[model samples]
Target: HEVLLRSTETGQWLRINPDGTVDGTRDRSDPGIQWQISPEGNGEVLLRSTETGQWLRINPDGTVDGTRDRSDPGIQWQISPEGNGEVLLRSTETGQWLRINPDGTVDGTRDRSDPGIQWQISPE
Candidate 1:
């Protein structure tokens, strides 16, 4: 189902920025902060920003970006449970987790202990 993902560490909605980067924001209208999560089986899924129609891609260089190509290797993500109501999105291509910084930007990180990696997925 389509939904809004809030960073558990920051309580901000995940979204695509004007520069085509993935980030967190308080705004929720217009294009909106909704995401289209498409399950790919075995805990893997594909995410696309509903507002911009860009696929969420995790780069091998430990960064995250929005892409138009669905076939990108970085497009696949595994929803790893954090043993709580929140969860982590692990990139299948780089084995890194999506990190939501307080600065309203996102990147890929390997630390599971970091709060930036936690996300509270809410239904739209």
Candidate 2:
């Protein structure tokens, strides 16, 4: 399904920033604001940001971001369903759960223990 990953804690929608970083935006515009989840086999999925035409990825240091480099394994995510419309995106490379910082920037939590890292996938 075409969707937007909303931060479970912040009530903001995940969007591709102009600088290519992943951040939460309050806008509901759907044209370039949507994301399509594509499976790349082996239980991994790629989050293609419609706006930037980039794949949401994990930086080598474990920061959650997006890039045009689609073949990188760091961009692949394991979508772990958490029930109640929530899901956890675990980085295929870093083994961390995608997290939303208080300032709205994206990253990943290594211990998988932060509730703020969980996201709500809402259909666009």
Candidate 3:
């Protein structure tokens, strides 16, 4: 049987540095994406999706920024509390999976809605 291997989906992790720059991690072990931070120590994280090749942003407060879809333009966002400061976002464009963490880490999974594809948050 031929096996199709799928790599772990490492979206993005933003570290709010004391300086005015935010550290980013893409796909793990790779150089992080650079972002400008504010004086209040708040930072914005940019994440590129592997499935849709779109960009996502995470605010300093562990909340998502900008609209749901990359193609769509607007500052609109829907915020929902998923317990423990983790949240799942759905865009007005329909269904877009944007998972955010309190530690500034994010995971963007494809919207398949299939029973076979099960995704969960594992203990680190």
Q: In terms of TM-score, which candidate is strongest?
A: 1
Top lDDT model = 1
What is the descending lDDT order?
1, 2, 3
Residues 1-124, candidate 1: write the lDDT tens digits: 6788888877888888656777778877735478898888878899888778888888878777889998899999888776767888888888898898989888988887988888888888
**What CA root-mean-square deviation does each model show from the true structure?**
1.6, 1.6, 13.5
Question: What is candidate 1's local distance difference test score?
Answer: 0.83
**Candidate 3 weakest lDDT stretch, 10 residues:** 1-10
The list of candidate 3 runs beyond 4 A from truth reads 1-75, 99-124
Please list the C-alpha lDDT of all candidates, in the order they appear.
Answer: 0.83, 0.81, 0.33
Question: Per-residue alpha-carbon lDDT of model 3 for 1-124, expressed as tens digits?
Answer: 1111111233344322222233334333322332221121122223333322334443334434332354442222333345654433333332344543334444344454422112222222
- Backbone clash count for every predicted candidate, in the order shown: 0, 0, 1
Q: Give me the runs in candidate 2 sitting further than 4 Å from their true place.
A: 30-32
Q: Rank the candidates by TM-score, best first.
A: 1, 2, 3
**Candidate 2, residues 1-124: lDDT per residue as tens digits?**
6888888887778878767777777778735459999978999889997777889888888677778887787988899997887888888898888888668777878766786787898788
